[PDB]
Write an enzyme that holds these catalytic residues in place. Structure first.
Site, PDB file in Angstrom:
ATOM      1  N   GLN A  95       0.789  -1.230   0.000  1.00  0.00           N
ATOM      2  CA  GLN A  95       0.000   0.000   0.000  1.00  0.00           C
ATOM      3  C   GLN A  95       0.820   1.277   0.000  1.00  0.00           C
ATOM      4  O   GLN A  95       1.760   1.448   0.783  1.00  0.00           O
ATOM      5  CB  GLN A  95      -0.951  -0.006   1.205  1.00  0.00           C
ATOM      6  CG  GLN A  95      -1.769   1.254   1.391  1.00  0.00           C
ATOM      7  CD  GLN A  95      -2.776   1.136   2.494  1.00  0.00           C
ATOM      8  OE1 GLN A  95      -3.926   0.796   2.248  1.00  0.00           O
ATOM      9  NE2 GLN A  95      -2.361   1.408   3.707  1.00  0.00           N
ATOM     10  N   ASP A 127     -21.882  10.761  -8.442  1.00  0.00           N
ATOM     11  CA  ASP A 127     -21.022  10.710  -9.592  1.00  0.00           C
ATOM     12  C   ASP A 127     -21.451   9.635 -10.574  1.00  0.00           C
ATOM     13  O   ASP A 127     -22.619   9.281 -10.627  1.00  0.00           O
ATOM     14  CB  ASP A 127     -19.593  10.451  -9.110  1.00  0.00           C
ATOM     15  CG  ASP A 127     -18.582  11.251  -9.859  1.00  0.00           C
ATOM     16  OD1 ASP A 127     -18.472  11.020 -11.076  1.00  0.00           O
ATOM     17  OD2 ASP A 127     -17.904  12.104  -9.239  1.00  0.00           O
ATOM     18  N   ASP A 170     -10.020  -2.687  -3.096  1.00  0.00           N
ATOM     19  CA  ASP A 170      -9.687  -1.558  -2.227  1.00  0.00           C
ATOM     20  C   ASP A 170     -10.824  -0.595  -1.852  1.00  0.00           C
ATOM     21  O   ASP A 170     -10.562   0.481  -1.325  1.00  0.00           O
ATOM     22  CB  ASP A 170      -8.552  -0.762  -2.855  1.00  0.00           C
ATOM     23  CG  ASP A 170      -7.535  -0.314  -1.844  1.00  0.00           C
ATOM     24  OD1 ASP A 170      -7.471  -0.933  -0.772  1.00  0.00           O
ATOM     25  OD2 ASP A 170      -6.783   0.632  -2.125  1.00  0.00           O
ATOM     26  N   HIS A 218     -14.455   7.924 -13.487  1.00  0.00           N
ATOM     27  CA  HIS A 218     -14.517   9.092 -12.617  1.00  0.00           C
ATOM     28  C   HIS A 218     -15.041   8.838 -11.199  1.00  0.00           C
ATOM     29  O   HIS A 218     -14.403   9.268 -10.245  1.00  0.00           O
ATOM     30  CB  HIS A 218     -15.361  10.164 -13.310  1.00  0.00           C
ATOM     31  CG  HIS A 218     -15.240  11.532 -12.708  1.00  0.00           C
ATOM     32  ND1 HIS A 218     -16.151  12.030 -11.800  1.00  0.00           N
ATOM     33  CD2 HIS A 218     -14.347  12.526 -12.926  1.00  0.00           C
ATOM     34  CE1 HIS A 218     -15.830  13.273 -11.492  1.00  0.00           C
ATOM     35  NE2 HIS A 218     -14.738  13.600 -12.156  1.00  0.00           N
ATOM     36  N   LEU A 224      -9.680   1.567   1.155  1.00  0.00           N
ATOM     37  CA  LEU A 224      -9.339   0.873   2.391  1.00  0.00           C
ATOM     38  C   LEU A 224      -7.894   0.854   2.848  1.00  0.00           C
ATOM     39  O   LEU A 224      -6.954   0.775   2.038  1.00  0.00           O
ATOM     40  CB  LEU A 224      -9.882  -0.548   2.334  1.00  0.00           C
ATOM     41  CG  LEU A 224     -11.390  -0.529   2.104  1.00  0.00           C
ATOM     42  CD1 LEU A 224     -11.871  -1.889   1.667  1.00  0.00           C
ATOM     43  CD2 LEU A 224     -12.111  -0.043   3.368  1.00  0.00           C
ATOM     44  N   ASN A 262      -5.246  -1.149   4.116  1.00  0.00           N
ATOM     45  CA  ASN A 262      -4.885  -2.565   4.069  1.00  0.00           C
ATOM     46  C   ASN A 262      -3.473  -2.792   3.453  1.00  0.00           C
ATOM     47  O   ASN A 262      -2.602  -1.913   3.537  1.00  0.00           O
ATOM     48  CB  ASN A 262      -5.973  -3.379   3.332  1.00  0.00           C
ATOM     49  CG  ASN A 262      -6.306  -2.839   1.947  1.00  0.00           C
ATOM     50  OD1 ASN A 262      -5.564  -2.026   1.374  1.00  0.00           O
ATOM     51  ND2 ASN A 262      -7.433  -3.297   1.391  1.00  0.00           N
ATOM     52  N   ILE A 281      -2.835  -3.504   0.066  1.00  0.00           N
ATOM     53  CA  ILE A 281      -2.877  -3.362  -1.390  1.00  0.00           C
ATOM     54  C   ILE A 281      -3.287  -1.943  -1.760  1.00  0.00           C
ATOM     55  O   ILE A 281      -3.849  -1.213  -0.917  1.00  0.00           O
ATOM     56  CB  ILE A 281      -3.909  -4.356  -2.071  1.00  0.00           C
ATOM     57  CG1 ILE A 281      -5.336  -4.072  -1.584  1.00  0.00           C
ATOM     58  CG2 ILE A 281      -3.536  -5.832  -1.797  1.00  0.00           C
ATOM     59  CD1 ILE A 281      -6.443  -4.708  -2.430  1.00  0.00           C
ATOM     60  N   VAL A 312      -4.110   1.940  -2.784  1.00  0.00           N
ATOM     61  CA  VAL A 312      -4.037   3.279  -2.180  1.00  0.00           C
ATOM     62  C   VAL A 312      -4.713   3.410  -0.800  1.00  0.00           C
ATOM     63  O   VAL A 312      -5.119   2.396  -0.204  1.00  0.00           O
ATOM     64  CB  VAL A 312      -4.597   4.393  -3.175  1.00  0.00           C
ATOM     65  CG1 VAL A 312      -3.751   4.454  -4.454  1.00  0.00           C
ATOM     66  CG2 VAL A 312      -6.058   4.157  -3.508  1.00  0.00           C
ATOM     67  N   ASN A 321     -13.082  23.514 -13.389  1.00  0.00           N
ATOM     68  CA  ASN A 321     -11.798  23.549 -14.043  1.00  0.00           C
ATOM     69  C   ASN A 321     -11.759  24.588 -15.162  1.00  0.00           C
ATOM     70  O   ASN A 321     -11.191  24.318 -16.220  1.00  0.00           O
ATOM     71  CB  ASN A 321     -11.487  22.164 -14.599  1.00  0.00           C
ATOM     72  CG  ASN A 321     -11.521  21.098 -13.533  1.00  0.00           C
ATOM     73  OD1 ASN A 321     -10.873  21.224 -12.511  1.00  0.00           O
ATOM     74  ND2 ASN A 321     -12.317  20.072 -13.745  1.00  0.00           N
ATOM     75  N   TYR A 356     -22.806  28.346  -5.031  1.00  0.00           N
ATOM     76  CA  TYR A 356     -23.756  28.672  -3.987  1.00  0.00           C
ATOM     77  C   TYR A 356     -23.091  28.844  -2.623  1.00  0.00           C
ATOM     78  O   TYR A 356     -22.056  28.215  -2.339  1.00  0.00           O
ATOM     79  CB  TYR A 356     -24.852  27.597  -3.927  1.00  0.00           C
ATOM     80  CG  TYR A 356     -25.707  27.535  -5.171  1.00  0.00           C
ATOM     81  CD1 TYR A 356     -26.200  28.700  -5.749  1.00  0.00           C
ATOM     82  CD2 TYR A 356     -26.021  26.318  -5.775  1.00  0.00           C
ATOM     83  CE1 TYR A 356     -26.979  28.662  -6.885  1.00  0.00           C
ATOM     84  CE2 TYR A 356     -26.801  26.263  -6.916  1.00  0.00           C
ATOM     85  CZ  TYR A 356     -27.281  27.440  -7.472  1.00  0.00           C
ATOM     86  OH  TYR A 356     -28.069  27.425  -8.616  1.00  0.00           O
ATOM     87  N   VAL A 362     -22.682  25.651  -0.385  1.00  0.00           N
ATOM     88  CA  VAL A 362     -21.731  24.654  -0.847  1.00  0.00           C
ATOM     89  C   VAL A 362     -20.267  25.065  -0.727  1.00  0.00           C
ATOM     90  O   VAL A 362     -19.881  26.169  -1.138  1.00  0.00           O
ATOM     91  CB  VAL A 362     -22.016  24.304  -2.306  1.00  0.00           C
ATOM     92  CG1 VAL A 362     -21.103  23.233  -2.766  1.00  0.00           C
ATOM     93  CG2 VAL A 362     -23.463  23.892  -2.486  1.00  0.00           C
ATOM     94  N   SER A 404     -11.976  18.087  -9.547  1.00  0.00           N
ATOM     95  CA  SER A 404     -12.813  16.940  -9.294  1.00  0.00           C
ATOM     96  C   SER A 404     -12.112  16.012  -8.322  1.00  0.00           C
ATOM     97  O   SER A 404     -12.762  15.335  -7.533  1.00  0.00           O
ATOM     98  CB  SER A 404     -13.130  16.240 -10.599  1.00  0.00           C
ATOM     99  OG  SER A 404     -14.302  16.792 -11.167  1.00  0.00           O
TER     100      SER A 404
HETATM  101 CA   LIG Z   1      -5.456   0.157   0.205  1.00  0.00          CA
END
Ligand SMILES: [Ca+2]
Length: 275
Positions: free
Chosen positions: A2, A32, A41, A64, A75, A77, A79, A81, A155, A171, A174, A221
């Site tokens: 990881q 999304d 993951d 996306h 997650l 763990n 493996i 990211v 963007n 707004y 937000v 994004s």
């Molecule tokens: Ca991970």
């Protein structure tokens, strides 16, 4: 093994993961293009699809939605990211399709679903150059109901002396998130304007892609989910906080970077924000 993406570390999230605050029990909606649940993951709790042509919200035909989801809750763990809030209950609200396009009625219905199913945080890594009385209302209703609504500023880069922040990010209700690179320099594509609130890492962000993959994308994004995850980490330390306290905490503890028209309040620091 990881790898922790630079972004999670830049907003100082691993400081909280070590205190035992990983965002457990906080519900976050990734409004999304759906989220691929078969990713080793990611752990998607539920969701709904408001795309007429695409009934499975656990299916992301674009890439996306999965990417955005991994920055928030990939997650912790052995493996891939790591997300900002790895123990967050991830919700796939598919309002965008395979081409990445979505209609406002779909988006608005996705926000409505997020409210009745009591989401603590709503993430909108999408936007447009125009508003709607229904879009303004959907997002205002979420805030009145205690939801923290995060959205990408857009963007559109600079435009003379005008705002290029799109909707719903434009707004007041937000939190409009812009993008900074590793050095803390505003990404040239990041929208500018008086509506920008905070900045979060958004250039070359490594995250999850459909079919047990990992790949980098650049955009406001990718900025948005760091602040959405950060709001979930704050909520796991202080579950009694109203969406208003999560917000002012995130904007008042920023690292000042430049003029607010281009940087908002600056870069978020979730470590100082969680208190
Ligand atoms: Ca991970």
């Amino acid at each position: 093994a990881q790898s922790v993406p630079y972004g999670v570390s830049q907003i100082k999230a691993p400081a909280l993961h070590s205190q035992g605050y990983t965002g457990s029990n906080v519900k976050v909606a990734v409004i999304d293009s759906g989220i691929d649940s078969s990713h080793p993951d990611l752990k998607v709790a539920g969701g709904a699809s408001f795309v007429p042509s695409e009934t499975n919200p656990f299916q992301d035909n674009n890439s996306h939605g999965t990417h955005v989801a991994g920055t928030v809750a990939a997650l912790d763990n052995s493996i891939g990211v790591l997300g900002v809030a790895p123990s967050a209950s991830l919700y796939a609200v598919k309002v965008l399709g395979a081409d990445g396009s979505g209609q406002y009625s779909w988006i608005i219905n996705g926000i409505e679903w997020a409210i009745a199913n009591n989401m603590d945080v709503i993430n909108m890594s999408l936007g447009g150059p125009s508003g709607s009385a229904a879009l303004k209302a959907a997002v205002d209703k979420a805030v009145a109901s205690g939801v923290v609504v995060v959205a990408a500023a857009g963007n559109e880069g600079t435009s003379g002396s005008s705002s290029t922040v799109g909707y719903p990010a434009k707004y007041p209700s937000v939190i409009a998130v812009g993008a900074v690179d590793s050095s803390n320099q505003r990404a040239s594509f990041s929208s500018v304007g008086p509506e920008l609130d905070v900045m979060a890492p958004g250039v070359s962000i490594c995250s999850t892609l459909p079919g047990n993959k990992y790949g980098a994308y650049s955009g406001t994004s990718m900025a948005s989910p760091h602040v959405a995850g950060a709001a979930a980490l704050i909520l796991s330390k202080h579950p009694n906080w109203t969406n208003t306290q999560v917000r002012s905490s995130l904007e008042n503890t920023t690292t000042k970077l430049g003029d607010s028209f281009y940087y908002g309040k600056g870069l978020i620091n979730v470590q100082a924000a969680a208190q």
